[PDB]
Design a protein around this ligand. Structure first.
Ligand SMILES: Nc1nc2c(ncn2[C@@H]2O[C@H](COP(=O)(O)OP(=O)(O)O)[C@@H](O)[C@H]2O)c(=O)[nH]1
Lengths: 422, 427, 422
């Protein structure tokens, strides 16, 4: 079993954990106590460790510079599921600064963190890779997640590392220093991860609100959508799928150059509870929905930008003759460079959710990511050039040239993604 | 971890903090006059030291007054631990110089020993909160020496001060502007954040938003206490995502000397089901950002914001927060360089007298008008040297009175220059 | 991008500005702070300048001989949108006299005004023309707008200049000296503008009141209708329309002789908020509505007078076979001279308003304009011949022959427009 180790870093990555792990528990027929619930299905071993007893243990580590995200997750939301010896807690938190997560505070926990990671690594014969789930907003997520990633890559250089980077909103999750942490941490993700998924919370809020225009939803829906997208990305790593069979294949399919690894996603039906009653989603509509504006979890229109890679992973019966006509029917909405064939790959895997006829998710390497980076970079520059809030970072060791370096690296990254636009 | 030590200095400081502690004890489920509880909720460890079944509020109670302990037993029962109460010998007669210079070395050493014990019963220090009044003789001068002393012993720890400034129209004593400037000079140098409150604003609120007829200071303190309990909700009720004092300093203070904040809350409800279930986040945001709930003599809708934060309590819908805040961004005025404007947070636990509630804090350039009025009153008295002998015969030099004024003017000039420059930072 | 510079002159032209500019901001998906709000659509560059940052800047100048119209617009109604360095303010105002706007006061501001105009001109590679929005009532509008127009035509003679001339009402906007300012300023517009649109506020008041006979409306409706008519006239200059593609084409389509440039308009549905609920306006009804009395923003019946030119600009799907039957069906309601073919041109462009199935506006060169001019000229003569209020103009330099010249020019203009009537 090619086993994956999942690490949740920061208050949001931890907030997500109970939704992510409950989906996996139900998907594979395991209860929330780790007990088997009937017949186990899928390659359970890839995400769960088998205990000396009948219990399955999520193969995961929770990291928080304060005590609170972990305390709520392991004591109130999903009791007895997470192993307490795999939880790392600090006391001070991060004061919302990148500087604490990466230079002044979070560094004292690296021996503890790498020790716990090795203990988890030592339990597996065939380790495929790591998934690091983190916010790029707050200092713990923005700071430690790259600190952890670098420590792992220097010890286990042959593994594939994937990050799930969550970009906070400009409204419900906003912060007055968001642009500093976002640029300072993109600068490190650029050299740290092999694959980096970008999920934009503002897209989630407007997409769910659109789907919910007819009803009252639930406040839990925003977290369920964010958690589900990770579960679906990973579906092919858990079931014997004819696609993204392994993290190494995701890397070879989607990332042509070491720096161009930032990926976008699209998902349909977003959540089962959003699409209820008569939901006979025919193979034809599902593929049109996946390139629709209201299914893309980014401020990206596929028609406005250029594709470098595009993989569509469906679940349930999806006849191949339909998938091919749907792709041909994309026309010029899905366009690549003249140095590439229109390398759009699609197929389907096993469905576990008894309420849905079919579903799917896509992974896109598209130039539109550059627009998010430029948005955040412009905000960074307005603040930086007039020293807003820089004293708080300088006080913890961020010599000013550190900010200048991040500024230049991101502008170069934006420039490179837009090369095919010109 | 984010444990809080409160310091209460002087009569106003003790009465305001008193109202706070008794409201905190209602939300957590503790007896306000005994400290005894069986079943409590929330993270009580942030503010209380629990021994057996008694929850002891972590506070240092300070006065210069000869019988401060008895004066507390009579109103607060046994809620406060007498070992934390520091009594004085004579008192400061509304004279900053007595609270600041001629207080007695022993008085200050005892206060510091009490503070050290309170910080010694913590796994970590989350911050200090100082409650006081700028026109007094102990809450001004002694409270100021305490900020100096605390910041020297514990640098890099967020100190929040809540203080009463002179009222805009009528004044209390003639000496009040001298006490107010020197207090402000020390707030400028030592606090991480300061919340500016005054009684004129609070009285208008008490008479128009509360149902109470002919309110006294006892009622007025429930508005201040409501600001204090709401600003600490996320700390007390945890949550996966939350706000500590260090989150507020990082997000609201763009420069080290522009930390003076305005505060506003709604709804204001006196104990009992006297409220109405408006249940609308949109209405509460519209109210908290209006001028009618501002707890200081200023008019924020006519100024410009450097930053602001909003904490929503109770079962507030995400969708309403986003729409409500969109309205706020469209109606108000912000400075371009800070491009995101706000810090937004939610805590699902309701205040005891309302299902929903909102607290807002922020940096509004309008605040200089409070400081400018104080400055001008001082300048006229200072030029004529009226009541001045009371400060120079108590250890100050004219130089100290002049330097304190100069520091205050520097802050005013920095807020105003930034605000005027801002009009063209958009072109 | 063929760029247009918009100038608002006088208290009313300025009053209109926030409605005009908000419509454009919403139409192109820009917020009122100039920030982008999702995908930008249409040729944004024609009306907005791009900042060194992500902000769009309205390409406009605001002129007021007093300080107040501008202060309210830029400080209270549409904050941070208008560039303060493009605002020109005097102190004295105009005492409602043409004489101040054109000879004694407004002249001292011409260096400032032309300097600001050049700064705006210097930012654009391809300038198509200018639009001057002004009242013909008050002295600032009636006086400066032609002073400004002459200064521009003498510097940039190859550009097309269009004016949007708003005729005040005989009731809510009335003045005891309205006839002097109206004749004195029509006299200059005659040689200044290439295209001059005339909008009559009395038609707006009776038309809206008719539509509102079933409800309480809003007091803002009168300004929204007036502002919208300009927005719709300009729609073809902002979208890639098959009509009025440029100001030069509007001139060639509508004005056969240098003096016969005064145009009338007709609009349907007037305002979205006036036509709510079930508003499936079929292509057929829309074209009948556009030549109806209640949609013409002038005291003009199309049946009573002669057309020289007629252009119908629609928005939304409007099948051409319907447009042709609607035109043929005009019969003798729409009649031209025997020296012209019935040159009625109609087509449609892009719709941006999600509440309307379709909409449209027409531009008419029709002899009925002569009736408005004669109405105002008769009032001028009654006052002039008995010296009412002439001392106020003579005191500021209007030698009496100046009034006599305007009187004769307008009578000649009326005579010329009515040639085909006889
Ligand atoms: N809001 C509020 N204001 C108070 C209260 N008590 C006093 N004040 C204000 O605080 C100012 C200074 O008070 P003071 O009694 O001289 O305090 P001390 O000398 O420092 O102990 C007074 O002039 C009042 O304006 C109170 O209970 N609440």
């Amino acid at each position: 079993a090619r086993e994956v180790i999942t690490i949740h870093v920061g208050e949001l990555g931890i907030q997500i954990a109970p939704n992510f792990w409950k989906y996996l528990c139900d998907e594979h027929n395991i209860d929330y106590k780790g007990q088997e619930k009937g017949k186990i299905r899928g390659v359970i071993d890839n995400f769960f460790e088998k205990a000396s007893i009948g219990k399955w243990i999520p193969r995961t580590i929770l990291v928080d510079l304060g005590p609170n995200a972990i305390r709520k997750v392991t004591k109130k939301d999903m009791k007895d599921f997470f192993d307490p010896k795999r939880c790392v807690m600090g006391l001070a938190g991060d004061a919302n600064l990148f500087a604490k997560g990466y230079y002044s505070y979070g560094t004292r926990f690296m021996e503890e963190i790498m020790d716990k990671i090795q203990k988890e690594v030592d339990q597996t014969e065939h380790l495929q890779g790591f998934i690091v789930v983190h916010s790029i907003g707050d200092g713990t997520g923005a700071g430690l997640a790259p600190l952890i990633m670098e420590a792992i890559k220097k010890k286990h250089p042959k593994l594939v590392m994937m990050s799930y980077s969550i970009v906070p909103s400009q409204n419900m999750d906003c912060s007055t220093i968001l642009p500093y942490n976002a640029i300072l941490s993109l600068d490190k993700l650029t050299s740290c991860a092999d694959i980096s998924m970008i999920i934009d919370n503002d897209s989630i809020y407007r997409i769910v609100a659109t789907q919910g225009k007819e009803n009252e939803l639930s406040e839990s829906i925003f977290d369920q959508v964010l958690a589900k997208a990770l579960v679906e990305i990973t579906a092919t790593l858990r079931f014997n799928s004819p696609l993204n069979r392994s993290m190494m294949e995701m890397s070879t399919n989607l990332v042509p150059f070491p720096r161009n690894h930032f990926l976008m996603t699209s998902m349909s039906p977003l959540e089962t509870s959003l699409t209820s009653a008569h939901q006979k989603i025919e193979t034809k509509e599902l593929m049109q929905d996946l390139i629709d504006q209201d299914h893309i979890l980014a401020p990206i229109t596929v028609e406005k930008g250029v594709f470098t890679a595009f993989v569509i992973a469906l679940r349930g019966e999806n006849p191949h003759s339909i998938l091919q006509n749907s792709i041909k029917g994309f026309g010029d909405r899905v366009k690549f460079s003249e140095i590439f064939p229109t390398a759009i790959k699609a197929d389907s895997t096993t469905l576990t959710d008894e309420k849905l006829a079919r579903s799917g998710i896509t992974l896109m390497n598209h130039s539109g990511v550059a627009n998010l980076f430029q948005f955040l970079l412009t905000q960074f520059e307005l603040m930086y050039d007039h020293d807003a809030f820089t004293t708080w970072y300088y006080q913890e060791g961020m010599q000013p040239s550190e900010f200048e370096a991040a500024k230049n690296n991101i502008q170069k990254l934006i420039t490179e993604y837009k090369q095919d636009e010109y | 971890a984010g444990e809080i030590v409160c310091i209460q200095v002087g009569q106003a400081g003790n009465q305001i903090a008193g109202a706070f502690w008794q409201k905190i004890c209602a939300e957590h489920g503790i007896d306000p006059v005994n400290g005894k509880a069986i079943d409590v909720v929330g993270d009580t460890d942030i503010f209380f030291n629990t021994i057996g079944d008694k929850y002891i509020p972590r506070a240092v109670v300070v006065d210069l007054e000869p019988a401060v302990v008895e004066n507390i037993r009579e109103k607060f029962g046994t809620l406060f631990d007498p070992k934390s109460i520091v009594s004085g010998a004579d008192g400061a007669g509304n004279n900053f110089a007595i609270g600041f210079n001629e207080h007695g070395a022993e008085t200050l050493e005892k206060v510091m020993q009490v503070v050290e014990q309170r910080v010694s019963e913590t796994e970590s220090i989350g911050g200090f909160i100082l409650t006081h009044s700028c026109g007094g003789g102990t809450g001004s001068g002694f409270g100021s020496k305490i900020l100096k002393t605390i910041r020297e012993r514990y640098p890099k720890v967020p100190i929040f001060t809540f203080s009463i400034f002179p009222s805009p129209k009528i004044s209390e004593t003639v000496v009040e502007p001298y006490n107010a400037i020197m207090t402000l000079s020390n707030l400028i140098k030592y606090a991480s954040c300061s919340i500016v409150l005054d009684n004129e604003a609070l009285f208008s609120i008490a008479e128009k938003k509360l149902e109470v007829e002919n309110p006294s200071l006892e009622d007025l303190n429930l508005i201040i206490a409501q600001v204090l309990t709401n600003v600490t909700a996320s700390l007390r009720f945890s949550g996966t995502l939350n706000l500590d004092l260090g989150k507020l300093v990082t997000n609201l203070v763009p420069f080290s000397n522009l930390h003076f904040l305005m505060a506003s809350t709604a709804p204001l409800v006196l104990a009992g089901k006297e409220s109405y279930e408006k249940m609308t986040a949109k209405e509460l945001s519209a109210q908290v950002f209006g001028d009618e709930y501002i707890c200081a003599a200023c008019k924020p809708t006519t100024g410009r914001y450097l930053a602001a934060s909003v904490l929503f309590r109770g079962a507030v819908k995400t969708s309403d927060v986003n729409e409500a805040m969109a309205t706020v961004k469209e109606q108000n005025s912000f400075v371009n360089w800070i491009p995101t404007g706000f810090k937004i947070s939610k805590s699902e636990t309701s205040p005891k007298d309302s299902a929903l509630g909102v607290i807002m804090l922020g940096n509004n350039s309008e605040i200089v008008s409070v400081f400018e009025r104080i400055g001008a009153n001082f300048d006229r008295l200072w030029s004529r040297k009226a009541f001045a002998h009371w400060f120079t015969d108590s250890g100050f030099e004219e130089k100290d009175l002049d330097d304190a004024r100069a520091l205050v003017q520097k802050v005013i000039d920095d807020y105003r220059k930034l605000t005027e420059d801002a009009e063209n930072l958009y072109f």
